[PDB]
Amino acid sequence: SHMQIFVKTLTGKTITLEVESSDTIDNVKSKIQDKEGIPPDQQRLIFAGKQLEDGRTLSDYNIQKESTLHLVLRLRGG
Amino acid sequence: QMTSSQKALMLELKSLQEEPVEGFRITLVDESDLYNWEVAIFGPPNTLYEGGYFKAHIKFPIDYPYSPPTFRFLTKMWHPNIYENGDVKISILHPPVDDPQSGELPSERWNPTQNVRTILLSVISLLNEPNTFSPANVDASVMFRKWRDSKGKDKEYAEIIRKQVSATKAEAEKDGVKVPTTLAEYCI
Ligand SMILES: COCC(=O)N[C@@H](Cc1ccc(-c2cc(Cl)cc(Cl)c2)cc1)[C@H](O)[C@@H](O)C(=O)O
């Protein structure tokens, strides 16, 4: 169930993450905080046009090996 | 002979046409005018927008990227975060306020390192995540809240989404576009 996924940042970098398909979005955001310093509640992860919800798993979204996600920060101020 | 803003726009256009954001297709409205882009947007699969074919225009100022563009849906989208005139409500489409008391970060306001790719990804986020505390469209925000609170039993908000998706079918057929309906088709 182990796989690599790619997380593209707004600064033009790619983060390569080692994950499990059963990992929750919470778990992925914790890894991104460890690598980038961004608090998890400010992170937003996008896959195929959808923002991923904290308590769901990668497999819930059919995110498979070598998938690419996009990391943005939550929009503020409305 | 190209101005600085024309050169910046040419670079961004080339990047977004050769390495597109999935579900977004970018073209010039007029072949000779780099300052007005058409953006064709697919509703993503496994959402209520699936099958939709939406269009927006991005209009750029003479001094891009030192000033922000506008991003406006041509046919209107009923959404808490989209103004009724079609403008999307995003902080980055406005210059910084230079107020250390405001608590705003550089990444949240326009600056010359911001770009269209960042705008598009911000629009995806805005479409996913209504801000009901500070809505662009109060009536859509109130309706969205009732839909969310009733667990979909008050169907009005979803009925409007379905109606606005259906209204795009004629435009898709005119453009000869087949809207993706699966993850594999959307990510091509
Ligand atoms: C509002 O509730 C209906 C709805 O479909 N909500 C989606 C959010 C959502 C995802 C994508 C868009 C979206 C994204 C793009 Cl790129 C274009 C368009 Cl037209 C819509 C909008 C909302 C949710 O992910 C929903 O699927 C879910 O799985 O919970």
Author numbering:
A (entry chain E): -1 to 76
B (entry chain A): 5 to 192
The authors write:
To better understand the molecular bases of Cdc34 activities, we here determine crystal structures of Cdc34 alone and in complex with Uba1, as well as a Cdc34~Ub mimetic that represents the product of E1-E2 thioester transfer.
To elucidate the mechanism by which CTDprox enhances Cdc34 activity, a crystal structure of a Cdc34~Ub(t) complex that includes a complete CTDprox is needed. Detailed analysis of the Cdc34-Ub structure reveals that CTDprox engages in an extensive network of intramolecular interactions with the backside of Cdc34 that is known to bind non-covalent Ub to allosterically enhance activity in a subset of E2s59. These interactions involve a short α-helix (hE) in the additionally ordered region of CTDprox. Tyr190 of Cdc34 CTDprox inserts into a composite pocket formed by residues from both Ub(t) and the Cdc34 core. Additionally, CTDprox Cys191 contacts Ub(t) Ala46, while CTDprox Leu187 contacts Ub(t) Phe45 and Ala46 and participates in longer-range contacts to Ub(t) Tyr59 and Asn60 (right).
